[PDB]
């Protein structure tokens, strides 16, 4: 509810998330993936963690993979794009090339109306900034898929037991009412 650790994986969109979460009344702290150890995060005492997008892959995302693996089941974690892929890979996921690389287009995904999608319209139009996707047949059994592209891509995953959730699209909203309601869902679990 209070203190959010946002992990910057060197994207401009981490500051959008900063503003969005601050407008929802959260105490947010933004630390770069290479300027942190896991010992650091114990000092900061976060209530929830968010892994940002970034131009890299999870392997090159500094501590992101280490953080998901160590804090899984201790604090809620929300992965956006890169963070969503990092969440799959963390539990033995496989990230593969997409059918079409999307550099800013908005498109309709279907969801299960649970997790961050509770009280959201289905289908839902979202904006995509990615070229890679989580491979469905490789997805670890600990994860349910929660959203699908219309080309049948994984657009959201969620752990079956713990509070860690991913989205492949950029939430980009909080003045959209159904965009505010998506991040508020993570914040007020």
Q: Tell me the C-alpha distance between 5 and 50, whole Å.
A: 6
Q: Which of 102, 116, 63, 56 is nearest to 82 (CA)?
A: 56
70 is catalytic: no
**Active-site hit among 56, 135, 172, 180:** 172
**Active-site hit among 56, 81, 130, 135:** 81
CB-based burial, 15-26: b 16+ in 10 Å, e otherwise: ebbbebbeebeb
142 is catalytic: no
Q: Tell me the C-alpha distance between 127 and 12, whole Å.
A: 15
Largest CA distance in the chain: 44
Tally the C-alpha atoms within 13 A of residue 85's C-alpha that lie toward its C-beta. Answer: 28
Q: How far apart are the first and last CA of the chain?
A: 8
Query: How far lies 157's CA from each of 10, 47, 121, 141, 148, in Å?
Result: 23, 21, 18, 11, 10
172 is catalytic: yes
Instruction: Name the residues annotated as catalytic.
Output: 81, 170, 172
């Amino acid at each position: 509810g209070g203190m959010i650790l946002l992990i910057d994986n060197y994207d401009s969109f981490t500051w959008n998330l900063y503003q969005y979460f601050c407008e929802l009344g959260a105490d947010v702290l933004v630390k770069r993936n290479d300027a942190l150890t896991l010992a650091d995060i114990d000092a900061l005492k976060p209530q929830k963690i968010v892994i940002s997008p970034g131009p890299c892959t999870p392997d090159e995302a500094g501590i992101s993979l280490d953080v998901i693996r160590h804090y899984a089941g201790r604090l809620p974690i929300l992965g956006v794009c890169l963070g969503h892929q990092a969440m799959a890979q963390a539990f033995g996921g496989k990230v593969v090339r997409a059918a079409k690389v999307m550099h800013g287009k908005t498109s309709p995904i279907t969801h299960n109306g649970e997790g961050v999608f509770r009280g959201l319209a289905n289908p839902l139009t979202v904006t995509r900034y990615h070229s890679l996707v989580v491979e469905p047949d490789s997805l670890p059994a600990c994860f349910d898929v929660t959203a699908w592209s219309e080309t049948r891509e994984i657009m959201g995953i969620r752990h079956r037991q713990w509070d860690l959730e991913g989205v492949q699209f950029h939430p980009e909203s909080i003045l959209s009412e159904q965009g505010h309601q998506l991040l508020a869902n993570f914040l007020h679990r």
